[PDB]
């Protein structure tokens, strides 16, 4: 979360595949009365202010991007999700269905609102994971282990603000992240677990095993053989919501020279990936916040991908060209140089 911005995805909606995927997601979530397309074309900035709308739109956009990438034939060798979007990771891995993932995200959002818990805020802290975790005041714990340098914590706004100001007193980098006014990955969510799991079981009926490529970021590596990690069951998603995000831990398994694509409406985690990844790795945003033409940025990302040695054919994105070609098409043989 935290990447949604007003007007996101409109540029890419011009593509046939993306619009079709968005329509399918909207149909999937149709019964509840929410239209992802309506949200995307929505003009009010507050449209993404709603947690439900933000979650649904983010999941839909991630699924659409995955569909576009699969259209060209790209087959990921690894998969890593960070807090929300784990469900999108599941859909990419094949263990989940588009309708299943969309419904899961929507139900997560809905149950989140129905909790009506006290306000919760997260602030990014320049302090490392170990020092912050021990230094955390009561009611504040390590929220997400983004990287060695940067760790985020979640808790009641009062102690969170007090510790943020105290840390800023030392000069350590501090910054509050837009949490929608509510905490995550903390004891707070623990209350919401029962109803959320009930809804997911109502939604998830045939859990499928997690693939080898997918690396759970909510299940510590020592437990990756556990019952939870085996299948992307509703319980796994609930734990994903409640448990701390061990994003940094999984990064160490990224092989050298790997090409890392950031499947997201906004390339938020680019800096974290650069800091916490092997220098040989390469990063490609695939989408920029409030960019003039997100389609151009996506095409540039695909081009950079092609420059990286991976094979991707842009023709799949657009409608097929009828053949044979019209007479007068320029000769190609003269253009070849040896």
Curated annotation (Swiss-Prot):
Cysteines engaged in disulfide bonds, as pairs: none
Localisation: Cytoplasm; Melanosome
Phosphoserine modifications at: 227
Catalytic residues, chain numbering: 83
Region Acyl and malonyl transferases, residue ranges: 1-319
In-chain residues carrying the UniProt-annotated modification N6-acetyllysine: 30, 175
Modifications the protein undergoes after translation, according to the UniProt entry: In adipocytes, S-nitrosylation of Fatty acid synthase occurs under physiological conditions and gradually increases during adipogenesis.
Tissue note: Ubiquitous. Prominent expression in brain, lung, liver and mammary gland.
Sites where the protein binds an acyl-CoA: 149-150, 173, 275
Quaternary structure and partners: Homodimer which is arranged in a head to tail fashion. Interacts with CEACAM1; this interaction is insulin and phosphorylation-dependent; reduces fatty-acid synthase activity.
Note: The relatively low beta-ketoacyl synthase activity may be attributable to the low 4'-phosphopantetheine content of the protein.
Protein's job: Fatty acid synthetase is a multifunctional enzyme that catalyzes the de novo biosynthesis of long-chain saturated fatty acids starting from acetyl-CoA and malonyl-CoA in the presence of NADPH. This multifunctional protein contains 7 catalytic activities and a site for the binding of the prosthetic group 4'-phosphopantetheine of the acyl carrier protein ([ACP]) domain. (Microbial infection) Fatty acid synthetase activity is required for SARS coronavirus-2/SARS-CoV-2 replication.
Protein name per UniProt: Fatty acid synthase
UniProt gene name: FASN
Full-protein positions shown: 499 to 836 of 2511
């Amino acid at each position: 979360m935290g990447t949604q911005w007003r007007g996101m995805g409109l540029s890419l909606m011009r593509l046939d595949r993306f619009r079709d995927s968005i329509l399918r997601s909207d149909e999937a979530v149709k019964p509840f009365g929410l239209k992802v397309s309506q949200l995307l074309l929505s003009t009010d900035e507050s449209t993404f202010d709603d947690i439900v709308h933000s979650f649904v739109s983010l999941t839909a956009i991630q699924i659409g991007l995955i569909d576009l990438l699969s259209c060209m034939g790209l087959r990921p060798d690894g998969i890593v999700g960070h807090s929300l979007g784990e469900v999108a990771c599941g859909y990419a891995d094949g263990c989940l269905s588009q309708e299943e993932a969309v419904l899961a995200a929507y139900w997560r959002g809905q149950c989140i609102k129905e909790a009506h818990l006290p306000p919760g805020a997260m602030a990014a802290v320049g302090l490392s994971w170990e020092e912050c975790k021990q230094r955390c005041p009561p009611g504040v714990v390590p929220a997400c282990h983004n990287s060695k340098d940067t760790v985020t914590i979640s808790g009641p706004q009062a102690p969170v603000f007090e510790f943020v100001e105290q840390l800023r007193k030392e000069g350590v980098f501090a910054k509050e992240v837009r949490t929608g006014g509510m905490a995550f990955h903390s004891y707070f969510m623990e209350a919401i677990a029962p109803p959320l799991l009930q809804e997911l079981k109502k939604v998830i009926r045939e859990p499928k095993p997690r693939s080898a490529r997918w690396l759970s970021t909510s299940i510590p590596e020592a437990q990756w053989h556990s019952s939870l990690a085996r299948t992307s069951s509703a319980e796994y998603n609930v734990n994903n919501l409640v448990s701390p995000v061990l994003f940094q831990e999984a990064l160490w398994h990224v092989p050298e020279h790997a090409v890392v694509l950031e499947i997201a409406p906004h390339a938020l985690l680019q800096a974290v990936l650069k800091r916490g990844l092997k220098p040989s790795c390469t990063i490609i945003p695939l989408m920029k916040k409030d960019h003039r033409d997100n389609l151009e940025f996506f095409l540039a990302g695909i081009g950079r991908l092609h420059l990286s040695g991976i094979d991707a054919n842009p023709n799949a994105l657009f409608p097929p060209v009828e053949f044979p070609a019209p007479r007068g098409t320029p000769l190609i043989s003269p253009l070849i140089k040896w």
